[PDB]
Amino acid sequence: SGIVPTLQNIVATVTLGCRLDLKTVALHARNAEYNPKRFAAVIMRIREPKTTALIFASGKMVVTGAKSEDDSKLASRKYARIIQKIGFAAKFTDFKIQNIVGSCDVKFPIRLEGLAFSHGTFSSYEPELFPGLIYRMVKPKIVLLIFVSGKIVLTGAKQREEIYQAFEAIYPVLSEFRKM
Amino acid sequence: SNAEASRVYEIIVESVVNEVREDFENAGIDEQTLQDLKNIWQKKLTENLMLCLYDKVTRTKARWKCSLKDGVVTINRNDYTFQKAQVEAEWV
Amino acid sequence: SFNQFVDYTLQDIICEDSTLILEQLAQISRKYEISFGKIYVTKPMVNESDGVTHALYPQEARLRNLTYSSGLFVDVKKRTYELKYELGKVFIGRLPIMLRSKNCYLSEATESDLYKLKECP
Amino acid sequence: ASILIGCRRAEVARTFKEIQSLIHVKTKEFGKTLNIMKNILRGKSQNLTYIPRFCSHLGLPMQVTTSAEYTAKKCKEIKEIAGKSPITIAVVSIYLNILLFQIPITAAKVGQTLQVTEGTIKSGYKILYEHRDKLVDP
Amino acid sequence: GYYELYRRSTIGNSLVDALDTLISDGRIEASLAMRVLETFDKVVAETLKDNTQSKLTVKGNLDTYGFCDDVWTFIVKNCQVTVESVISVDKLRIVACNSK
Amino acid sequence: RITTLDETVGVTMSHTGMSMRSDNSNFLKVMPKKEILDYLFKLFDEYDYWSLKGLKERTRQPEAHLKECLDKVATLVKKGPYAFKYT
C-alpha cells in the first residue's frame, strides 16, 4: 500500500446572524456575482485561499472550494470580515464542515463487473450510464467512486479519518479484483 | 486615426440636426439657432473605457470569456468602434 | 380465391376507408389527417424470442408449432392543416398464408426442391 | 424501468436509447427511478446478447455474428478502454468483423442505422486495428 | 428602451457639454436637450448596430468583475487589444448591458 | 398488384419496433407592496372589474405578493357576472 488519499474539496457553512439587501451589496462590493433570475444569492470569491462562498439574504453563507480545513475556516473568516467591512453587523459563528471530497490512485486496473457481482448489496455499476462504480460503504458511511484506470474518489464524509478509514477499508477489495 | 469614426460622426451630426429640426420648429426658436448648434457642436468635436453590450459571459475555474457586440472603446486617447469582441481574461 | 383476396381485396379494403382526420379547435381552426396507401405483403417469416427474424418453411412451421404467416406493412401518410392551409412504412400485423399460394415459398418450388424442403410432391 | 427490469431478468438486451425512443422519460429521472427500483428488488430478497440484434439490424450472415461474438469476448479480455459503454464496443466489433470480409456498408450507413457517431467507431477502429493480431478466430 | 450608457463616451460627453453650454451660456430652452440625448441614444444604438465592422480581442488579467441589474462591469489590468494592430493597456474598464 | 418487399427482413423488422430513431417528423408535437398596490389602483382606474388571473397576466411579477396585495385593498367577488374578480 502506502497510498494516502489527497483532499480535493471541503464544503462548510457559516452563519453570520443578520440580514442583507442584494442590490446595495452587489453595488458596493468588489468581486461578487449576483442574479436573482437564476440564483438568489451572491457568489463571492477570494484569491487567497481560492474559494467560493454563496451568500444569502438570511445571513447564511456556504464556503466551499478549499483543499484543507484551515483554508476553509480562514477563508470563511475572510468572507465574514468582508461582510463586516461592507456595513453589516455580521458575526463568524456556527462553522461546521459539511462535506469532504478526496481522491487517490491505486496504480492497477480494477474489475468493476466482479466487484459489482460480489458486493452487489453496496455497489451500483451501470457502464452505459456511468462508467464508474458507486460503492456505498456502511461503516464509515462513505460514497466511493471506483473507475477502471484505478482513480478512487471518496465523498460524503464529515472528517478526514472517515476518508482514511474508507480507503483502508476499500483497499483490500480493490486488490482482490485486480487485473495486472 | 480612423476615417470611419469621422464618417460615423458626420452621419450622427447630420441625422441629429435633421431629426431635431422638427422639434426646433415646434418650439419656435430659430433655424439659425440650430445652425449654431451644428457649428458649435462640430467645433467642440473638432480614460480607457469600453461601452457596449454583452451576449454571453462564461467562467471556467478562473478563466472568463465574454462575447461583446456593438461598442465604442477609448484607449490611449484613441477611439474605436467594434461590432464584435471577445474577452479572454484570467482571475487570480 | 385466396390469391385474388391477397392481390385485390387487401388494396380494396385499405383504399375504401383509409382517410381519417382529426378536427382541432383553438381560439384559429386546425386539422390533421392520416391516410393509408399501397399496402405491402412480405414472404413468410418468423420472429423468435431473442429477436432474430428468419424465413419460415411449412415443415419447420409444423415442427415448432408456429403460425405460417407473413408480415404486412402500409404506407401511412400524415398531414397537418391549419383551414385548408397544408404545411412511413408501418407494420400493421401478420396474415396467415395458405400453402401452394403465390405468397408461400412452395408454389414456385420444383419436385427436387420439394424433396429438399422435405415436402411431398 | 419496469420494462427494462423485465428485460434484464429474461436475459434480453434492450438499450437505453430504445426504451427512451419509446417513452420520453428524460434519462436522468429514469436512471434514478431505475436505481431505487433496483434497490427495491434487492430489498425483496452482458453485451454479448446485443451482437445478434444489431447483426439483425444490418442483415449480416451468421459467420459475421459469431465472429463479432468471439471478437466481443476477446476485446472484453484484452482490456484497454475497457468499454466506454458496451454499445460502442459492439458497433466497432461488428465494424471490424465487417471490414474483414467484403460486404460493404461503410461508416456513414452503419452510423446512421445503429445511431452511433462515426468518430467513435473510427476512434475504436484505430485501437481495434491495433489489437487486430489476437482477434483472428481461424 | 435605448440605454443611456453611450452618453459616457467621448462624443457623448461632448454633446452633453455642448447642450449644457447652450443652456448655461445662452437662453436655449431646457428639456429639449434631453430629447437630443434620447435621439443621440437611438442614433448611436442603430449606428453602432449597423455601421460597425471591426472585431477586437482583449486578453489580460481580470482584476475586478461584477454584475448588477443586467450590468456586467469588468476591470482588466495589463491587457492586449487586437483590432481586426496590437495595443497594450495598463488598465481597462468595460461596462456592458443585456442585449436581449 | 401488391408489391412484395424482397429485403433481408431484419432491416424492415428493425424499422418496425424500437430502432433508436425518434422525432425526424413534426406531427402532433405541440417586490415592494406599496408600488404593487399603486399599480393595482391604476388598473382599477382603467377598469374596476378584473380577474385575479388577468391581473397576474398584466402586472408580470411574483404572484404571491400580488395575491397578498389583492387580499388587502380589494374584495373578491366569487359569484354573479363579475365572478372570481376583485373590486
Instruction: For residue E2, give the 3-state DSSP assignment.
Output: coil
Method: cryo-EM
Chain B neighbors of E40, CB-CB under 8 A: 12, 16
Fold of the CATH domain A1-11+98-180 = TATA-Binding Protein (3.30.310)
- Peptide bond before residue D52 is cis, with ω within 30 degrees of 0: no
Chains linked to B by 3 or more Cβ pairs within 8 Å: A, E
* Residues spanned by the domain of B21: 3-46
Q: Which H or E run contains D31?
A: helix D28-43
Q: Which residues, listed in sequence order, are joined to residue B58 by a DSSP beta bridge?
A: B65
What distances in angstroms separate CA D54 from CA A126, B13, D62, D84, D111, one per listed residue?
A: 21, 71, 12, 18, 12
- Peptide bond before residue C96 is cis, with ω within 30 degrees of 0: no
- Of D135, E80, E3, D20, nearest to B52 (Cα)? E3
Please spell the DSSP secondary structure of chain B, one letter per residue: --HHHHHHHHHHHHHHHHHHHHHHHHHT--HHHHHHHHHHHHHHH---EEEEEEEEEEEETTEEEEEEEEEEEEETTEEEEEEEEEEEEEE-
- Of A58, A85, A67, nearest to A12 (Cα)? A67
With beta carbons less than 8 A apart as the criterion, state whether D31 and C69 touch.
Answer: no
Distance CA C118, CA C103 (A): 19
Which residues of F1-87 form beta strands (DSSP E)? 50-51, 76-77, 85-86
- Domain extents for chain A? 1-11+98-180, 12-97
Residue C9 in grid coordinates: 381485396
Residue type, B36: D
Distance CA D122, CA D117 (A): 9
Distance CA A116, CA A135 (A): 9
Burial of A25 (0-12, 13-18, 19+ CB in 10 A): buried
∠ CA(A103), CA(A108), CA(A113), 5° rounding? Answer: 90
* Overall resolution, Å: 4.8
SS3 labels along chain C? CHHHHHHHHHHHHHHHCCCEEEEECCCCCEEEEEEEEEEEEEEEEEECCCCCEEECCHHHHHHCCCCCEEEEEEEEEEEEECCCCECCEEEEEEEECCCCCCCCHHHCCCHHHHHHCCCCC
| Chains F and C touch, contact meaning at least 3 pairs of CB atoms under 8 angstroms apart | yes
Chain A neighbors of E67, CB-CB under 8 A: 26, 33-35
Query: Can you state the percent helix, strand and coil of chain F, rounding each to 5?
Result: 45, 10, 45
Fold of the CATH domain A12-97 = TATA-Binding Protein (3.30.310)
Mutation target for A interface from E68, E73, E93: give the one with most A CBs within 10 A.
E68
| Chains A and D touch, contact meaning at least 3 pairs of CB atoms under 8 angstroms apart | yes
Min Cα separation C98/chain F (Å) = 16
Which residues of E1-100 form beta strands (DSSP E)? 55-67, 71-83, 86-98
Distance CA D114, CA D17 (A): 10
User: Residue holding cell 472517515?
Assistant: A162
Phi first, then psi: give them for residue C77, nearest 5 degrees.
-105, 135
CATH code for the domain in which residue B16 is found = 1.10.287.100
Residue of B nearest to E67 (CA): B57
DSSP code of F35? H
> CB neighbours of D104 closer than 8 A, spacing ≥ 6?
none
Q: Which H or E run contains A54?
A: strand A51-55
Distance CA D37, CA B67 (A): 45
∠ CA(C95), CA(C100), CA(C102), 5° rounding? Answer: 65
∠ CA(C21), CA(C12), CA(C106), 5° rounding? Answer: 130
Inter-chain CB proximity F19 and D21 less than 8 Å = yes
